Structure 1
């Protein structure tokens, strides 16, 4: 037992390790999406930049969880980072829809982690998740929904003109 450990349940420690993996996975999904938009036969540079930014942000989410694990005297155990479900992301709209789905899955995991913190009476962990994770998820989900709505209303994915103009006027 770490000299620093206090009020930190083994189940919470294990859940934090699962969430570290999930955020690394999310970073990898967005990395794949980014470079899909960098292909010469897709060529939407601002979709590419947008998803690369999200990829680096997810990696920061994972590092802050790793820091948390050590702060509480837990021990980090890393697992393989699974490759994303898709190699080809089809369209800007489809990538946005996939990102929305991903963020809702990450949110569900964080809400389950918060419930575990509650159940184990770990207010420091509750506060950590609330302060640093839950509103980030709500903001991300709202932003992605807004993007999906605009792309659909503009006529994507069939209108390549729509995705081109959204790339310039929203993601620019």
Structure 2
């Protein structure tokens, strides 16, 4: 029997599908970077897409551990184009902050229901979101300091393509 409420279960299932879209969105940024010839930036986004799937699977396993079930929903078409290298990463940061707020909303719902298990489970994502936002802010800061010089952009592309 399910020991999370249907409201909490649906909130968690909604976030799983949101994590799937985040994966799809980052792959779409890879299609943009590859079209612009930045295979290092595209590589960074492909690795980011795979990491987002592990976030989705962590929601997946917790839902079943609490006696629930996952229902996959349609994935909306992501944007394919951005007005430059820095514009894409600014869209990534805005998305991650949106995901952080979505995690907050589940946390507050679970907290009002005294669902301490789900509240505690979400702590990992709260801390992880802090790191996800910082990693994009650092990249954005280096892109701003580059100020469009292919000199620096070439090294940052080579550097981000180095991601394991």
Q: Which residue is equivalent to 1:34?
A: 30
Deviation per CA, 1:110-154, whole angstroms, max 9, x where unpaired?
0111111111111111111102x1111100101111111110121
- Alignment CA distance shift 1:169-1:63 (3 Å): closer
Structure 2 gaps of 5+ residues are none
Q: Is the 8 A contact 1:93 1:151 kept in 2?
A: yes
Q: TM-score, normalised by structure 1?
A: 0.88
Superposed displacement of residue 164, structure 1? 2.2
- Matches of 1:148 and 1:32, distance apart in 2: 19
> Considering only aligned residues, what root-mean-square deviation do their CA atoms show, in Å?
1.5
The size of the alignment, in residue pairs, is 162
Deviation per CA, 1:4-36, whole angstroms, max 9, x where unpaired?
x33x12210010111011000000000111122
Superposed displacement of residue 87, structure 1? 1.4
Q: Is the 8 A contact 2:42 2:161 kept in 1?
A: no
Looking at both structures, which has the greater relative contact order when contacts are Cα pairs under 8 Å and sequence separation is at least 6? Answer: 2
Structure 1 gaps of 5+ residues are none
Q: TM-score, normalised by structure 2?
A: 0.92
Q: Is the 8 A contact 2:43 2:160 kept in 1?
A: no
Moved over 3 A (4+): 159-162, 169-172
